[PDB]
Scaffold this active site. Structure first.
Site, PDB file in Angstrom:
ATOM      1  N   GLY A 162       1.776   2.797  10.415  1.00  0.00           N
ATOM      2  CA  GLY A 162       2.540   3.727  10.732  1.00  0.00           C
ATOM      3  C   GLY A 162       3.612   4.483  11.835  1.00  0.00           C
ATOM      4  CE  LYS A 181      -0.382   3.573   4.651  1.00  0.00           C
ATOM      5  NZ  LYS A 181      -0.804   3.678   6.184  1.00  0.00           N
ATOM      6  CD  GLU A 228      -3.338  -2.534   7.545  1.00  0.00           C
ATOM      7  OE1 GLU A 228      -2.449  -3.276   6.342  1.00  0.00           O
ATOM      8  OE2 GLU A 228      -4.038  -1.369   7.404  1.00  0.00           O
ATOM      9  CB  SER A 257       4.448  -1.569  12.432  1.00  0.00           C
ATOM     10  OG  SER A 257       4.165   0.032  12.279  1.00  0.00           O
ATOM     11  CD  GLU A 286      -3.569   5.359   6.546  1.00  0.00           C
ATOM     12  OE1 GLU A 286      -2.238   5.128   7.099  1.00  0.00           O
ATOM     13  OE2 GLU A 286      -3.748   5.580   5.254  1.00  0.00           O
ATOM     14  CG  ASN A 299      -1.840   1.009   1.776  1.00  0.00           C
ATOM     15  OD1 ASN A 299      -1.693   1.796   0.552  1.00  0.00           O
ATOM     16  ND2 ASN A 299      -2.303   1.410   2.147  1.00  0.00           N
ATOM     17  CG  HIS A 329      -5.913   2.015   4.641  1.00  0.00           C
ATOM     18  ND1 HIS A 329      -5.467   2.756   5.952  1.00  0.00           N
ATOM     19  CD2 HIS A 329      -4.987   0.976   4.722  1.00  0.00           C
ATOM     20  CE1 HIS A 329      -4.558   2.757   6.311  1.00  0.00           C
ATOM     21  NE2 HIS A 329      -4.485   1.781   5.794  1.00  0.00           N
TER      22      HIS A 329
END
Length: 249
Positions: free
Chosen positions: A172, A12, A166, A212, A96, A10, A94
């Site tokens: 991140g 992003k 996740e 991560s 985000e 991904n 996702h």
């Protein structure tokens, strides 16, 4: 035995033409000798470039999001538009997008259902926040998110679904889940699928871990029996993604 693993990148909202050309060359020159589906998810504007340059036969291209229908939705990209350009994988839900862009469980479930109807392979993202984990709500949260998706699918649609667990606190941040933490959740999910959807579906379902992952922790995660690969953010922009792929042997 385990189903076919997935190693998914991904990217992003990152990349330039020059950096992508270099990274795709690295991926093309890495010979992959085992059975794995590699996925790269560039930004929308970089999809044509990656289609032109990526030649490694183990890879497919995915979008990072989509809406279900074409029409009067300024700024968005629809599933029919993606199919027409040759993209038939999508990441949906996702963290985000759930956090910044208002995607609720019902919005995600609707998108997943529509993608499956239109013939996509879908990577559907679920996971708990740090507050939910410390409140001992992890199981309730991830099973709620999964059951919302499942409510809009038929059994046959599950052949097109990949789940990505996740934990939001791992995305991140550098704070990867331990193999035991990830395995506990993956096992809980696979059991829920087995009881609520079917044991045949559960045995074939890929459940990926993300948050991560790097080339040094990937092999110890993959050693766990219910982890089927990875959804990788930051480390997928680097040449060490090659070793993340090879950790799924």
């Amino acid at each position: 035995a385990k189903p076919q693993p997935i190693a998914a990148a991904n990217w992003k909202c990152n990349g330039t033409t020059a950096s992508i050309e270099k990274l795709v060359q690295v991926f093309n020159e890495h010979t992959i000798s085992h059975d794995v589906q590699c996925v790269v998810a560039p930004t929308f504007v970089h999809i044509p470039l990656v289609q032109a340059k990526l030649r490694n036969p183990k890879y497919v291209i995915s979008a990072q999001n989509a809406i279900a229908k074409s029409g009067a939705f300024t700024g968005e990209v629809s599933m029919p538009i993606l199919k027409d350009i040759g993209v038939h994988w999508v990441i949906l839900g996702h963290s985000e997008r759930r956090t910044y862009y208002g995607e609720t469980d019902e919005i995600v479930a609707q998108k997943v259902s529509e993608a499956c109807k239109q013939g996509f392979m879908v990577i559907a993202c679920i996971g708990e926040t740090l507050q939910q984990r410390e409140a001992n709500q992890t199981a309730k949260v991830v099973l709620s998110q999964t059951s919302a998706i499942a409510a809009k699918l038929t059994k046959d649609a599950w052949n097109q679904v990949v789940l990505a667990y996740e934990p939001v606190w791992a995305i991140g941040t550098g704070k990867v889940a331990t193999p035991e933490q990830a395995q506990e959740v993956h096992l809980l999910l696979r059991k829920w699928v087995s009881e609520n959807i079917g044991t045949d579906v559960a045995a074939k379902l890929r459940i990926l871990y993300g948050g991560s992952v790097n080339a040094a922790n990937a092999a110890t995660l993959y050693a766990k029996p219910d982890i089927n690969g990875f959804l990788v953010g930051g480390a997928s922009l680097k040449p060490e993604f090659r070793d993340i792929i090879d950790a799924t042997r």
